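Entry for K15 complex. Fields follow.
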Amino acid sequence: GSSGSSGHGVCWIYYPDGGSLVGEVNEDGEMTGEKIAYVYPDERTALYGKFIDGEMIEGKLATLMSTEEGRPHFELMPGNSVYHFDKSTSSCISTNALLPDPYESERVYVAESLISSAGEGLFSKVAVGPNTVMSFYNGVRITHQEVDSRDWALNGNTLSLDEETVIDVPEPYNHVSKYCASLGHKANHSFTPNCIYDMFVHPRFGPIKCIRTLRAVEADEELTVAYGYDHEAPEWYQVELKAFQA
Ligand SMILES: CCCCCCN(CC[C@H](N)C(=O)O)C[C@H]1O[C@@H](n2cnc3c(N)ncnc32)[C@H](O)[C@@H]1O
């Protein structure tokens, strides 16, 4: 009446790894909707689409073009590439083993390693700064007991994830033609690495490890990482180890 007259809120959840969830939350404050997005650590590559409580139901490849007062504008990338939360188990590595991670695909590729008799290695596509997430280490999730209690000829692709879980990429998935959803396992070992394994929360893969650079790397530099066995360990390692003090 006798008073002057006149005539919604976006939320960002950042992970320690630099990735993030973004959208409007529902009445209960959960990331639920069809306009929710996950944003890779480059803060431009995105998976936009349907999410229930932060879990990706249907993420379409997208680019974060700009942000205005916390409100992100997304723009769909060309194609039919869609992604969903697809956490592996102890026997299922992926529901779409041949569906590449789009972020990884821009940064790494697999070629023959420069380290002799190392096999294949992982290489960069891009000159980047230190601390750049480059690649993802996904695989099946088996316990420390199963791993530790079997031969070393089975553990060439095992990477401890935490106190409870080891990640493995077992036969035939060590072949790029059978599994290329993630490529972290293609990085060979150096006692003078340019990367580390690091924690990562992936919208498709769940909690896993990634390869993150320790420093600047050139386009086409081989990406290496210290495997970190205890001082037991495979022969080539034990051999490379002793052949390093010099
Ligand atoms: C705990 C870390 C888990 C990820 C390791 C996976 N692979 C690397 C990928 C392998 N080049 C391949 O083409 O599937 C390691 C295998 O590659 C060779 N390799 C890795 N680094 C090497 C080095 N510095 N020297 C010789 N051989 C090496 C050995 O045959 C390993 O079993």
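NOTE: The radius of gyration is 21 Å.
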